[PDB]
């Protein structure tokens, strides 16, 4: 139907905007601490601690399959990256501190993304 095509076009345009948001958030992680999944070979207990692991590569795979239907879903995955790290790692660590800085800098980006999503529809 044409209505289905129009819905598909809207999902495609959201995907474009989320790809630009993702790029901008990932630039706030210049150490690449959050680029890839925590390796269970290197951290064999991880899934005892963290029940829903997340990282920027995993988000990019979901995005490219148009698997984010709205900005809330995207933000949920970004918050998992941060919140997982801040639980597993202590305050005194470069990992925790990178997560704080990514959260603080990412908030700015997400605040304007929300306005664009609402504005454009």
Fold classification of 1-121 (topology level)? Histone Acetyltransferase; Chain A (1.20.920)
Q: How far apart are the first and last CA of the chain?
A: 21
| Radius of gyration from C-alpha coordinates of the chain | 16
Alpha-carbon distance of 16 to 30, in angstroms, equals: 22
Q: What is the CA angle 68-103-78, rounded to 5?
A: 20
Structural domain boundaries of the chain?
1-121
- Report the candidate in 72, 76, 82 with the shortest Cα–Cα distance to residue 29: 82
Experimental technique behind these coordinates? X-ray
- Report the candidate in 72, 49, 68 with the shortest Cα–Cα distance to residue 60: 68
- Report the candidate in 92, 20, 31, 81 with the shortest Cα–Cα distance to residue 56: 81
Alpha-carbon distance of 15 to 18, in angstroms, equals: 5
φ and ψ at residue 22, rounded to 5 degrees: -60, -40
Look up residue 54 and give its two tokens: 């997340």
Stated in angstroms to one decimal place, the resolution of this structure is 1.5
Alpha-carbon distance of 23 to 43, in angstroms, equals: 27
- Report the candidate in 114, 110, 88 with the shortest Cα–Cα distance to residue 99: 88
């Amino acid at each position: 139907s044409m209505e289905q095509v129009a819905m598909e076009l809207r999902l495609t345009e959201l995907t474009r905007l989320l790809r630009s948001v993702l790029d901008q958030l990932q630039d706030k992680d210049p150490a690449r601490i959050f680029a890839q999944p925590v390796s269970l070979k290197e951290v064999p207990d991880y899934l005892d601690h963290i029940k829903h692991p997340m990282d920027f590569a995993t988000m990019r795979k979901r995005l490219e399959a148009q698997g984010y239907k709205n900005l809330h879903e995207f933000e949920e995955d970004f918050d998992l990256i941060i919140d997982n790290c801040m639980k597993y790692n202590a305050r005194d660590t470069v990992f925790y501190r990178a997560a704080v800085r990514l959260r603080d800098q990412g908030g700015v980006v997400l605040r304007q993304a929300r306005r664009e999503v609402d504005s454009i529809g």
